[PDB]
From a paper:
On one hand, it binds to the host 40S ribosomal subunit and blocks protein translation. Recently, the cryo-electron microscopy (cryo-EM) structure of a complex containing the 40S ribosomal subunit and [name]-[name]-2 [name] revealed that two C-terminal alpha helices, consisting of amino acid residues 154 to 160 and amino acid residues 166 to 179, bind to the mRNA entry tunnel in the ribosomal subunit.
In this study, we determined the crystal structure of the N terminus (aa 11 to 125) of [name]-[name]-2 [name] at a 1.25-Å resolution. The overall structure consists of three α-helices and seven β-strands with the arrangement β1-α1′-α1-β2-α2-β3-β4-β4′-β5-β6 from the N terminus to the C terminus. The intersecting β2, β3, and β5 strands are arranged in a parallel or antiparallel manner, forming a core, while the β1 (residues H13 to L16), β4 (residues V84 to L92), β4′ (residues I95 to Y97), and β6 (residues V121 to R124) strands, the α1′ (residues V23 to D25), α1 (residues V35 to D48), and α2 (residues L61 to Q63) helices, and the loops (the remaining residues) surround this core, forming a closed barrel. The residues forming the core were mainly hydrophobic amino acids, among which G52, L53, and V54 lie in the β2 strand, V69, F70, and I71 form the β3 strand, and L104, G105, V106, L107, V108, and P109 form the β5 strand. Regrettably, we failed to observe the electron density of residues T78, A79, and P80 in this structure, possibly because this region is quite flexible. The N-terminal structures of the two proteins were nearly the same except for two regions. However, the second region (residues 93 to 102) possessed a great difference in structure with little difference in sequence identity between [name]-[name]-2 and [name]-[name] [name]. In addition, we demonstrated that although aa 11 to 125 alone cannot directly inhibit host protein translation, this segment is necessary for [name] to function. Thus, a model of [name] inhibition of protein translation is proposed as below: First, the C terminus of [name] binds to the 40S ribosome and enters the mRNA entry tunnel; second, the N terminus of [name] is pulled into the vicinity of the ribosomes, acting as an obstacle to block the entrance of the mRNA entry channel.
Numbering used by the authors: 9 to 76, 80 to 124
Amino acid sequence: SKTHVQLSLPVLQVRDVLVRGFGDSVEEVLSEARQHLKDGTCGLVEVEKGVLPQLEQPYVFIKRSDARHGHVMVELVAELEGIQYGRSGETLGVLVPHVGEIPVAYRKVLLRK
């Protein structure tokens, strides 16, 4: 019922990811990402060169939403064909479904719902 929720997200290496995106439209990927976040079945891939071309568009990014418990404040921004829906701060990673892959870290976030 809150505007923000504390979550700990598993950080996945891109080559381990089994389900490489959330859906087929900007609205769908945002909707599905929010549902997986709520259900604790959302992973995070940190963006490096070569990562994004190995995932499926539209992308869902988590981006830093301000500057000021390790739960960095973030919001969701989708991208399709180089157009972004939402404007925010720096990217912490790209969200993907988590289906039991072994992570390399956990990232604590305070997610704006």
